[PDB]
Design a protein around this nucleic acid. Structure first.
Ligand SMILES: [Mg+2]
Ligand SMILES: [Mg+2]
Ligand SMILES: [Mg+2]
Ligand SMILES: [Mg+2]
Ligand SMILES: [Mg+2]
Ligand SMILES: [Mg+2]
Ligand SMILES: [Mg+2]
Ligand SMILES: [Mg+2]
Ligand SMILES: [Mg+2]
Ligand SMILES: [Mg+2]
Ligand SMILES: [Mg+2]
Ligand SMILES: [Mg+2]
Ligand SMILES: [Mg+2]
Ligand SMILES: [Mg+2]
Ligand SMILES: [Mg+2]
Ligand SMILES: [Mg+2]
Ligand SMILES: [Mg+2]
Ligand SMILES: [Mg+2]
Ligand SMILES: [Mg+2]
Ligand SMILES: [Mg+2]
Ligand SMILES: [Mg+2]
Ligand SMILES: [Mg+2]
Ligand SMILES: [Mg+2]
Ligand SMILES: [Mg+2]
Ligand SMILES: [Mg+2]
Ligand SMILES: [Mg+2]
Ligand SMILES: [Mg+2]
Ligand SMILES: [Mg+2]
Ligand SMILES: [Mg+2]
Ligand SMILES: [Zn+2]
Lengths: 101, 218, 51, 216, 129, 149, 83
RNA sequence: UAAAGUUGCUGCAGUUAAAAAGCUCGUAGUUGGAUCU
RNA sequence: AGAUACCGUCGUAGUUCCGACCAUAAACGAUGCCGACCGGCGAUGCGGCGGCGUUAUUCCCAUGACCCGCCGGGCAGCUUCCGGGAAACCAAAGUCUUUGGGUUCCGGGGGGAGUAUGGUUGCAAAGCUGAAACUUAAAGGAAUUGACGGAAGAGCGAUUUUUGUACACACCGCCCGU
């Protein structure tokens, strides 16, 4: 019984895809199958923003951002709840979740 | 006492439709069981083919229901089949009889060789499918009889076929699928375009269109 | 059953595109005086930007 | 119109169509709605041939008139834009209107209160009145639809290529269909314009109702 | 590669007949195909057809009447004696009241009944009913 | 599809229905034949001759004008190569691949392509032996191939 | 249809689709029998005569009943030739 | 022996029930486009 | 409890390159290749063709970047009562009792067993070909309702919070090897 038409990966018209290492557990997982996440955040948190803006020597100094690319295997993605199981009909929907308010 | 709830029933009760072939010509669905009783009447005989217990697993235990298979026919060109599931056997049998006489189709009968007298066999080879079951009917010479399994033979006799050869493939131990496949094969006899049906069709007034003024009154 | 005094369809001038005028002409209706031909939009950009 | 001069389209009808925008379609085209289209202009809008629209409307009127009992025709609208037009058409012609929701099993479940056995069905939109269309296939019911450039034609027998998005266009189409049916019946005449104007069939849009309420 | 032309033509005709089409285009043409279509048309199964003549192998446009249930080819072309014809009739035809087997004999391309009348055998090409 | 590739392309030429020489063409059959002879003496294969005639002199099809094909005209005149041009090109390509491969021992793809090319050469040589264009002792050998072309 | 004596032996003669010539069976509930009215060429009113078409459910499911009805009406002269 | 369309030429199967060679080339074998009254 | 495991510290062959062997993978789309026909829709990669209009090459064509289409091969996607199928699903897994386009390999209830033996290849490990005696009434596929979890009108038919199941005497289950 096939669960998915694409076999859970994004490989089409090619034979081999080089593996990467899970950020959490360092497992080898093919790059097309891995769960990718691009994280752009602030170096300083919300309270730290107000605590730092007063102690800075510059005027309206913009705090730098952190850019990180994260790769997860299926087990770590499910365990960390960045990915959840869906219904048989809801599996097909591949629209990203509505994070934009 | 019968009080029809549809236009067709009101027309039939008021003696506006002469035969069931008038209904069959326009492919009008039949929703009232009393129409078939009105037309075919006493010539209909039915037989229970199988009583099948089915079970649904629940928290307290299995829940059992009984499914009845009933075949009906007048042995003179019409045949029907019905399946009904209920808590009691008698209720399931009554429902199956009603559902079987609701879905009654006419049967076309032909000749094997020289066309002398009344038709006795199927017009040509006809195949019916249900699940994995495939049933094939082949014309047979006069006096041959029905060469088939016990289950198809009852339906073929009720349809009015005298002679026929039969082939079957698939899991025929499934009595419901075995009966439905041969019922489908029988039903396909009037839907086959033979060269003697090539004439252009002359249309006629529909019973709804013909008796609209009488329907407005009632 | 509210009815206005005048029809909203009644217009002294109705604007049409040249293609609509040609379609009317093919049906021998190019003599209408209420028609006014408007310049079509120069740029053909009617699709949502894929992304 | 079998090329008869009496049944030809007049200038006033063309002006009404142009004002209502019935000749304007969508950006998408159905592959079975392509014989009624004329040409795709810039901005992707498809233009509808009004002569074929008139021919289809006349064919639909001929189909409707052929039914003896006028009450055997059912006219159904689900969107709010067509409800008033359908009610006015039923009042002027004698058909049976279904405005708002269509209850499943109306044509099939014979023990329901609203069970009906119409001989003809007219709908405002195949994509919005799909439920009445589907139940027609169960009881041998012919169907007439007011289709658009992108509209499925399954179970649709007579398709009238109009614009069914705007309220003005829908009201005008229903008004013209009623007028043609009445003129073919031999009730009103073709020598003088009809007494009722096509604005009675338009959608009220309660914003317009509030605006007119405070006019005086 | 394409190794049988009559097979492709008959398969195309059958597929177009199932879909309710009014006309079929079959290419390439062949005089065997023309003879087969003539045999079919004499009995009223297809109707008139027109041969489009390009300078390479031709094409045919065939009108359809809706009377064709099945047209098929037999491969390989088996030799049929006049005493073995009834077995092929039983195997391939739906009834004894209609249907035809098409044979190529030394007299020409004909149906099985015409081959019985002329008392000759041949090779089976196909059937239609 | 291709004999030795999975590709299934459809690109080719489509000759017009009419076989009559166009009115504007002023050339006669003899002038076309003289042009063909001069081009052959210059050292051009029939394919190149046809390309040149099509591009420059407005000769769409020599067989339509002169009634004969380029190779048959050359054979009648006697200016025809000993072995056919397509086989010559196949052998030349095989020689080029074999010369490359001797300096690059680890190029397995070159070995695969050389096998394919030599298979095509064997097919064409057998066909030409069947038609007696080649003597029934002609053999393609890798050592002899350089001298052959 | 009939025996050697010529007597017709059938329950009924089914009607065929006007579009595809297929037989419309007794349980084909998606089939339609539609009438199109005829008008007088002088006045344009309802003559009282009509033309009957029958379409099977297979064509209707294909979405081809619109074109078939249009062509049938054109052939009978109901629809203008310059449609 | 039939039942066995469970040896299938008529007439079986090969995604998940038993099953298509890891891939390509290639001799023998099998098969082979129109056209001549 | 016990760890000869999972966890952590080191660490030998190996992991890297050259030359000779080995020919095995869930080497998978678990789906042989060639050819024909049979529904729509929107994208995408390569080549070509046509066409308003924005940009760069200071001007001009012309060539690049966009925009709107058409054709031909290619990797795929959505939809459909085309038709199939036990179903899951498949525009091929369709055009099959209305059974024949060409051709190659290959299966015949579950174990014994890919084991013994013979042959052959290899330095070895092993690769290819490949049984029988005997034993057994089922093993197995798809889907449904329950029970568990150290998880969050429509269907042939049973039948009509999500999810997994080899459980159904229903985890107090079933089951593997000494
Ligand atoms: Mg791999
Ligand atoms: Mg993934
Ligand atoms: Mg059994
Ligand atoms: Mg090859
Ligand atoms: Mg090329
Ligand atoms: Mg035996
Ligand atoms: Mg047998
Ligand atoms: Mg057989
Ligand atoms: Mg088997
Ligand atoms: Mg397997
Ligand atoms: Mg493979
Ligand atoms: Mg060979
Ligand atoms: Mg030949
Ligand atoms: Mg360790
Ligand atoms: Mg370490
Ligand atoms: Mg292996
Ligand atoms: Mg894989
Ligand atoms: Mg495999
Ligand atoms: Mg493309
Ligand atoms: Mg590319
Ligand atoms: Mg391009
Ligand atoms: Mg077969
Ligand atoms: Mg075994
Ligand atoms: Mg055993
Ligand atoms: Mg029920
Ligand atoms: Mg049911
Ligand atoms: Mg699991
Ligand atoms: Mg699983
Ligand atoms: Mg379960
Ligand atoms: Zn991980």
């Amino acid at each position: 019984t096939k669960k998915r038409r694409n076999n859970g990966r994004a490989k089409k018209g090619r034979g081999h895809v080089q593996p990467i290492r899970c950020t959490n557990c360092a497992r080898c997982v093919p790059k097309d199958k891995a769960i990718k996440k691009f994280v752009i955040r602030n170096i300083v948190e919300a309270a730290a923003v107000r605590d730092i803006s007063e102690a800075s020597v510059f005027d309206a100094y913009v705090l730098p951002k952190l850019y990180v690319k994260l790769h997860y295997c299926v087990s770590c993605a499910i365990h960390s709840k960045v990915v959840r199981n869906r219904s048989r009909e809801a599996r097909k929907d591949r629209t990203p979740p509505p994070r934009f308010r | 006492e019968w009080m029809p709830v549809t236009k067709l029933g009101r027309l039939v009760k008021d003696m506006k439709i002469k035969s069931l072939e008038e209904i069959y010509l326009f492919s009008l669905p039949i929703k009232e069981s009393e129409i078939i009783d009105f037309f075919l009447g006493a010539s209909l005989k039915d037989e229970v083919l199988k009583i099948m217990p089915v079970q649904k697993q629940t928290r307290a235990g299995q829940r059992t229901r009984f499914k009845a298979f009933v075949a009906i026919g007048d042995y003179n060109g019409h045949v029907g089949l019905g399946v009904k599931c209920s808590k009691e056997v008698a209720t399931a049998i009554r429902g199956a009889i009603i559902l079987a006489k609701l879905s009654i189709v006419p049967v076309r009968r032909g000749y094997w060789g020289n066309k002398i007298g009344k038709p006795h066999t199927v017009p040509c080879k006809v195949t019916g499918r249900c699940g994995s079951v495939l049933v094939r009917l082949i014309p047979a010479p006069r006096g041959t009889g029905i060469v088939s399994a016990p289950v198809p033979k009852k339906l073929l006799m009720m349809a009015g076929i005298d002679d026929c050869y039969t082939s079957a493939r698939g899991c025929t131990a499934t009595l419901g699928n075995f009966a439905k496949a041969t019922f489908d094969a029988i039903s396909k006899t009037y839907s086959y375009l033979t060269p003697d049906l090539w004439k252009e069709t002359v249309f006629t007034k529909s019973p709804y269109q013909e008796f609209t003024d009488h329907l407005v009154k009632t | 059953n509210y009815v206005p005094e005048v029809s909203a369809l009644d217009q002294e001038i109705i604007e049409v595109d040249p293609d609509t005028k040609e379609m009317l002409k093919l049906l021998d209706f190019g003599s209408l005086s209420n028609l006014q031909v408007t310049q079509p939009t120069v740029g053909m950009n009617f699709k949502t930007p894929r992304g | 119109s079998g090329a008869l001069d009496v049944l030809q389209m007049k200038e006033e009808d063309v002006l009404k169509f142009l004002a209502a925008g019935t000749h304007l379609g969508g950006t998408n085209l159905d592959f079975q709605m392509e014989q009624y289209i004329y040409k795709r202009k810039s901005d992707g809008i498809y233009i509808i041939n009004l002569k074929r629209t008139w021919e289809k409307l006349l064919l639909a009127a001929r189909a409707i008139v052929a039914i003896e009992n006028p009450a055997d025709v059912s006219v159904i609208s689900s969107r709010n834009t067509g409800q008033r037009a359908v009610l006015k058409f039923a009042a002027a012609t004698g058909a049976t209107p279904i405005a708002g929701r269509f209850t499943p099993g109306t044509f099939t479940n014979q023990i329901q209160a609203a069970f009906r056995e119409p001989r003809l069905l007219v709908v405002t939109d195949p994509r919005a009145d799909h439920q009445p269309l589907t139940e027609a296939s169960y009881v041998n019911l012919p169907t007439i639809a007011l289709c658009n450039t992108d509209s499925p034609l399954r179970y649709v027998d007579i398709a009238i290529p109009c614009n069914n998005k705007g309220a003005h266009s829908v009201g005008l189409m229903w008004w013209m269909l009623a007028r043609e049916v009445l003129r073919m019946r031999g009730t009103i005449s073709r020598e003088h314009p009809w007494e009722v104007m096509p604005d009675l069939y338009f959608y009220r849009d309660p914003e317009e109702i509030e605006k007119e309420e405070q006019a005086a | 590669v394409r190794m049988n032309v009559l097979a492709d033509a008959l398969k195309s005709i059958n597929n177009a007949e199932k879909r309710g089409k009014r006309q079929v285009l079959i290419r390439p043409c062949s005089k065997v195909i023309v003879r087969f279509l003539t045999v079919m048309m004499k009995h009223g199964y297809i109707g008139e057809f027109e041969i489009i003549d390009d300078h390479r192998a031709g094409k045919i446009v065939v009108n359809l009447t809706g009377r064709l249930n099945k047209c098929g080819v037999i491969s390989p072309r088996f030799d049929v004696q006049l005493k073995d014809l009834e077995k092929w009739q039983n195997n391939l035809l739906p009834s004894r009241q209609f249907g035809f087997i098409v044979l190529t004999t030394s007299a020409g391309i004909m149906d099985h009944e015409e081959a019985r009348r002329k008392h000759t055998g041949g090779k089976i090409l196909g059937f239609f009913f | 599809g291709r004999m030795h590739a999975p590709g299934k392309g459809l690109s080719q030429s489509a000759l017009p229905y009419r076989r009559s020489v166009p009115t504007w063409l002023k050339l006669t059959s003899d002038d076309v034949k003289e042009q063909i002879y001069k081009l052959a003496k210059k050292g051009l294969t029939p394919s190149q001759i046809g390309v040149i005639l099509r591009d420059s002199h407005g000769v769409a099809q020599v067989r339509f004008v002169t009634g004969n094909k380029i190779l048959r005209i050359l054979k009648s005149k006697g200016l025809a190569p000993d072995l056919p041009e397509d086989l010559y090109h196949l052998i030349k390509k095989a020689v080029a691949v074999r010369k490359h491969l001797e300096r690059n021992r680890k190029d397995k793809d070159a070995k695969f392509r050389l096998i394919l090319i030599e298979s095509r050469i064997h097919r064409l040589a057998r066909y030409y032996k069947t038609k007696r264009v080649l003597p029934p002792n002609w053999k393609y050998e890798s050592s002899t191939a350089s001298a052959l072309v | 249809m009939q025996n050697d004596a010529g007597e017709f032996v059938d329950l009924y003669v089914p009607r065929k689709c006007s579009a595809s010539n297929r037989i419309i069976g007794a349980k084909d509930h998606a089939s339609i029998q539609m009438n199109v009215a005829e008008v007088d060429k002088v006045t344009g009113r309802f003559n009282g005569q009509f033309k009957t078409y029958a379409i099977c459910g297979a064509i209707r499911r294909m979405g081809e009943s619109d074109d078939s009805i249009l062509r049938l009406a054109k052939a009978d002269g109901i629809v203008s030739k310059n449609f």
